[PDB]
Design a protein around this nucleic acid. Structure first.
Lengths: 66, 100, 93, 110
RNA sequence: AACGAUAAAAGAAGUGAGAAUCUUCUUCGCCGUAAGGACAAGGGUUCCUGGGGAAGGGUCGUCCGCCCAGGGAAAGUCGG
RNA sequence: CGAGCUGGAGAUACGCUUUGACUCGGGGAUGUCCGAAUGGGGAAACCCACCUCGUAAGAGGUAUCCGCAAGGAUGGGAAC
């Protein structure tokens, strides 16, 4: 989520997580308008993890370029 | 003074038992999904088919027994405690309700 | 790109009676075209689509109060298949 | 109502310590604090018990008389009181955790 | 005082806590280069389904173009 | 800082926290569309492009004024 055991990934598998939570949340909305969603926290934490990706790679564009 | 009453119901008259209540209530309950008159199959079990099924029917049948029980006798009974039992995939359903 | 452009599912009675032959419909974001979404519904599930539409869809709604009413705009897309009768399990719903 | 900004955002008590009640009803009534917050400044002690009744429109056979719940309070009590008398905080010691301060008056235990 | 053109109404059936005034039926009448129908500007979601009844409706109101929930307008060729 | 938090409207459930959450300090990164806005157009938030980099997506450039290597500039400020 933040440890050094995550930012070590390159720009191939690390970016794969970006489109991993967006698609997952997509199958969570259909249950919100059908009465099958019983995990309100499945959205809060999810979106919170999505931000823990585009922020890391963004740091690899200033610390290694100046 | 503690007495526990029980009942054993065969899976013979349990399936159709819900098929008449589920479809029966659906023709009355107001669901934003569809209008009161047409119901698919795989939609009601997703809307309230979680705790508004075996639970509602259970509390409904039991309440009827206590209600009519006071209409045929006319004497308030004592205090009883109903206990919710785990529901199976669709077979014999038993329960245990005792009291003082 | 493929999983993007979304909004909310559909559950009417007409959107279902027609879904029996192969007529799906999934809402989309307040901003989307027809060419970009076309390749976001086929590569999302795995089937070719012919028809697809998308346009602003407002809906003023409220209860009580003097705080006006909000206008929520959510475009809707009604795709269609040629030979594909089912995709996964959403058709047998 | 200033959101009860009279005092401050902290609390001189915890949610697992023994706190009594005074300057009110039931004198010398000891108990344990459960729920409490610095915002609206509310305290839930197992000592002060107030019989209340809940009202529910229609939730699958209502049937609810007068249940037994607790009542929230304010800074009308004294937290950490074992010397059979109300005290405060003025002795700060340490053991093996230099990341947490201690409280004491003439004893040392808490 | 007035309840907003002197194109009127009647009965039966139903509903309901309660109906002259809601519904159904069958009659009566009035418009018919219109008091029919289709567009444009303009309004905005008033539309349809189920509910409701304080307020608006110059009486009632169980009804509404009133209040709430939901749903409803998918065109390479009609307009732009 | 510290053992609570999950905004006002306080309601329901799921959850976030003693491997130091919330909150307070203070820096960073994201920053749709409009708005001098300056890509071109335009009844503000709408329409239409072109080029370069490139798996799709996606990113950046694209007014005019003075010097014309950098850079600065025409907009906004109650009152003074």
């Amino acid at each position: 989520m933040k440890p050094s055991e995550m930012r070590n990934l390159q720009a191939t598998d690390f970016a794969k997580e970006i489109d991993a939570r967006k698609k997952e949340l997509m199958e969570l909305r259909f249950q919100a308008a059908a009465g099958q969603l019983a995990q309100p926290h499945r959205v809060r934490q999810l979106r919170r993890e999505v931000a823990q990706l585009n922020t890391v790679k963004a740091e690899l564009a200033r610390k290694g370029e100046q | 003074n503690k007495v526990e009453f029980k009942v054993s119901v065969p899976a013979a008259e349990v399936n159709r038992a819900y098929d008449q209540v589920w479809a029966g209530l659906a023709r009355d309950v107001r669901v934003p999904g569809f209008r009161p008159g047409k119901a698919p199959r795989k939609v009601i079990e997703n809307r309230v088919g979680k705790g508004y099924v075996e639970s509602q029917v259970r509390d409904r049948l039991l309440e009827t027994h206590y209600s009519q029980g006071l209409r045929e006798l006319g004497l308030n009974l004592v205090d009883a405690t109903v206990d919710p039992q785990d529901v199976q995939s669709g077979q014999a359903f038993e329960f245990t309700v005792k009291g003082e | 790109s493929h999983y993007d452009i979304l909004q909310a599912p559909v559950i009417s009675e007409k959107a279902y009676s027609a879904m029996e032959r192969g007529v799906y419909s999934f809402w989309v974001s307040p901003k989307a075209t027809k060419t970009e979404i076309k390749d976001a519904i086929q590569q999302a599930f795995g089937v070719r689509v012919i028809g697809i539409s998308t346009m602003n869809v407002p809906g003023k709604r409220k209860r009580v109060g003097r705080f006006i009413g909000q206008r929520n705009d959510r475009k809707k897309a009604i795709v269609r298949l040629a030979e594909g009768q089912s995709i996964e399990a959403l058709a047998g719903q | 109502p200033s959101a009860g900004s009279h005092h401050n955002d902290k609390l001189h008590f915890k949610k697992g310590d023994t706190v009594i009640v005074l300057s009110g009803k039931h004198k010398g009534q000891t108990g344990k604090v459960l729920l409490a917050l610095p915002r609206d400044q509310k305290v839930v002690v197992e000592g002060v018990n107030v019989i209340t009744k809940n009202v529910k429109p229609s939730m699958t056979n209502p049937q609810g008389g007068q249940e037994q719940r607790e009542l929230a309070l304010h800074a009308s009590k004294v937290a950490l009181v074992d010397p059979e008398t109300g005290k405060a905080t003025r002795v700060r010691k340490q053991i093996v955790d230099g990341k947490k301060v201690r409280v004491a008056v003439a004893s040392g235990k808490t």
